[PDB]
């Protein structure tokens, strides 16, 4: 575990993370995809060997010894708000199980279902709260990666408010 488990947020490409493992915002088919998924495919393409997994689950594949946790959030274009909310919460619970199983002291994590899978809605709070629900009982240092400067502000505020 980390000596004083923390949450942090950085505004940069998760493919340049400084953590012991990465969570991919994966598609269910293990395809190179778009956005975070494409960046992860370019950095760790070996991790896409048999990475296909259903919505609401996480599947870890090693790139060398570096674990890539493929977490499949729901596409809110296809799911109802209710069912999508359930699957988004479930994907993060599976990430917490994997992070725990791997014994890492740190994990880089994007906000699931906030990009192309958001169904064109702002899901920062919904996705971040499900991340906290899952990860709060883990003792890994969690570093959240985002690209938008105002998202960085809002995530940093949400972290600092519970401190």
Annotated binding site for ADP-D-ribose: 13, 27, 35, 115-117
Residues whose CB falls within 8 Å of the CB of residue 129, separated by 6 or more in sequence, listed in order? none
Residue 17's region, left for phi above 0, alpha for psi from -120 to 50, else beta, is: beta
- Binding to Cl ion, residues 104-163 (CB under 5 A): 115, 117, 146-148, 151
CB of 71 to Cl ion, least distance (A): 10
**CB closer to Cl ion, 13 vs 83:** 13
Helix axes 124-135, 81-102, angle to 10 degrees: 40
- Taking CB under 5 A as the rule, does residue 46 contact Cl ion? no
Q: How many chain residues bind Cl ion (CB under 5 A)? A: 8
Whole-number Å distance between alpha carbons of 104 and 22: 10
CB of 34 to Cl ion, least distance (A): 8
Whole-number Å distance between alpha carbons of 88 and 19: 23
- Taking CB under 5 A as the rule, does residue 42 contact Cl ion? no
CB of 124 to Cl ion, least distance (A): 8
CB of 54 to Cl ion, least distance (A): 16
- Binding to Cl ion, residues 48-107 (CB under 5 A): none
The dihedral built from the CA positions of residue 114, 120, 124 and 125, taken in this order, carries a sign that is negative
Residues that bind Cl ion (CB under 5 A): 12-13, 115, 117, 146-148, 151
């Amino acid at each position: 575990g980390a000596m004083a488990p923390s949450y942090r947020v950085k505004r940069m490409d998760i493919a340049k993370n400084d953590e012991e493992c990465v969570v991919n915002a994966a598609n269910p088919r293990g395809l190179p995809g778009d956005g975070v998924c494409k960046a992860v495919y370019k950095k760790w393409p070996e991790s896409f060997k048999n990475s296909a997994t259903p919505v609401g689950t996480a599947k870890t594949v090693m790139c060398g010894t570096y674990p890539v946790i493929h977490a499949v959030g729901p596409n809110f274009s296809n799911y109802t708000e209710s069912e999508g909310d359930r699957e988004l919460a479930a994907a993060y619970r599976e990430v917490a199980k994997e992070v725990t199983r791997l014994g890492v002291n740190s994990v880089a994590i994007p906000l699931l279902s906030t990009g192309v899978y958001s169904g064109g809605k702002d899901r920062l709070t919904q996705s971040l709260n499900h991340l906290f629900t899952a990860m709060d009982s883990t003792d890994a240092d969690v570093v959240i990666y985002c690209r938008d400067k105002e998202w960085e502000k809002k995530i940093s505020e949400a972290i600092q408010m519970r401190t």
